[model samples]
Target: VDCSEYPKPACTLEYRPLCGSDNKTYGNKCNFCNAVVESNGTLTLSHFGKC
Candidate 1:
């Protein structure tokens, strides 16, 4: 499926830090999953909270 127009999920204005397998801390879950998809599943949810 072409996820090109999937409407990139927006980061919430509120803070809810999440750690990604890429060793990065995303603003929220939306950006976390976005990173995963963008990286073709190379990046994944490592853990919740700041990296």
Candidate 2:
């Protein structure tokens, strides 16, 4: 998925959690999205809580 397509203005600012396909823990969807936006690739989510 291309996170870059999503407008940052619509994203939340709360501190959530995520298990990225990259085997990393992200504080929130927006946080993970930032990396996906930066990766320029289809980054996947392992789960919602974390890895």
Candidate 3:
């Protein structure tokens, strides 16, 4: 993840902005693993891909 854009943590790229109902949390709520967790829960990838 590109941490250069963040203002705080140097590696804080866990800001994958997605809705609560479809989005899932992972890696201490990191963005990289959110989708993987969501898929495991059977949530539609469409809900997680955008927004």
Candidate 4:
């Protein structure tokens, strides 16, 4: 999917997908890390690709 196509400003960050420990796909590492904070450390990088 073309993640950047989203109209939201956050989606404009980048298209570097990252697999999180929660088994989720983040648009980029920055987003992934942000999720970690938002989730209170419940999330982490599982790999460097789409989940």
Most TM-score-accurate candidate = 1
Residue-level lDDT tens digits of model 1 in 1-51: 223443364656777898887789989766776777888767767788998
Stretches > 4 Å off in candidate 4 = 1-11
lDDT values for all models:
0.71, 0.76, 0.39, 0.68
Give one clash count per candidate, in the order shown. Answer: 0, 0, 0, 0
Provide C-alpha RMSD values for all models, in order: 4.5, 3.1, 8.5, 7.6
Q: What TM-score quantifies how close candidate 4 is to the native fold?
A: 0.68
Q: Runs in model 2 with CA error above 4 Å? A: 1-13
Off by over 4 Å in 3: 1-29, 41-51
Local error of candidate 4 at residue 13 (angstroms):
3.0
Better of 1 and 3 by lDDT: 1
lDDT of 2 at 28: 84
The predicted structure with the larger TM-score, 1 or 3, is: 1
* Candidates 1 and 4, the one with greater lDDT: 1
Query: For residue 27, what is the lDDT in candidate 4?
Result: 86
